[PDB]
Amino acid sequence: STGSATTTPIDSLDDAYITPVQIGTPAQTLNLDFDTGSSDLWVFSSETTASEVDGQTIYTPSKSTTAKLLSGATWSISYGDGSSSSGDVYTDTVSVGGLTVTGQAVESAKKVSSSFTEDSTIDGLLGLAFSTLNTVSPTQQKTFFDNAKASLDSPVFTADLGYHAPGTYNFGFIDTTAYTGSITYTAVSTKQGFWEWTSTGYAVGSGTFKSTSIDGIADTGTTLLYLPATVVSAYWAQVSGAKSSSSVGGYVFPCSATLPSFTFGVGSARIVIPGDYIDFGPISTGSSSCFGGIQSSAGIGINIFGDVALKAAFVVFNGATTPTLGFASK
């Protein structure tokens, strides 16, 4: 089997991407944030505290003929941005892009933090990191990918995120029309439960490439590119008037600037992030200070290749017995 679903930016900045997911019988379609940095599929639901729901579409298990309470199971998760959610668990039928899993754990939120309530466009998350990170207790649950894997034509999924445009998540196949050149594969460590890999270095604009190992994770659920402070300083030093602002919470730059590209290494291959991708616009409405898309990972404890980096590439998440990541230009 295969599946193929379009993923759409939630706003004009590509802050996140939503993908429609069918849950239950008859189908209830919810728009989920597919997150390669976490391992829970959780949804706004009929159980979510009413004051914490503001425009989201909810899953109502009582209206699904295939829903069953997973008795005694609970979940609770905290993300890198300080947001959180928790609740109880149902099993149900879940389909993505025509690929169906029966018996998927659907984590029903009883509580969500303010950042979720305030984002009316995201109805929940679909985690695509390794199932070792799943938070369901006392019986840990599998991701949608892990449950689909054995049925797929190839044990893979691909992320093809758009810049200010829709893109695609495919399950079970490589679309050889979706990228240019060849795919460069690189080793993955699953020790922390992430799609963790080592970049071979970077370049700023037309500058020389610096060969240096950068360990980090491929995380579709993180907006920005978080890299070591040395690398980030070297980037922003090429933008007149850029500075790190403790008041704003990272590097800002004059909205009048033209940003340089940023290149990262994948083995001997190179992925180029155009400068435009690194512009996250005014820090507050009407400001002439703009927020940068490359930020320091210092204090986060891991480097994160978030959407800014991933949307410059066609990315293969190879879930074979020895997992690997692939990157191609597009």
Ligand code: NA
């Ligand atoms: Na922000």
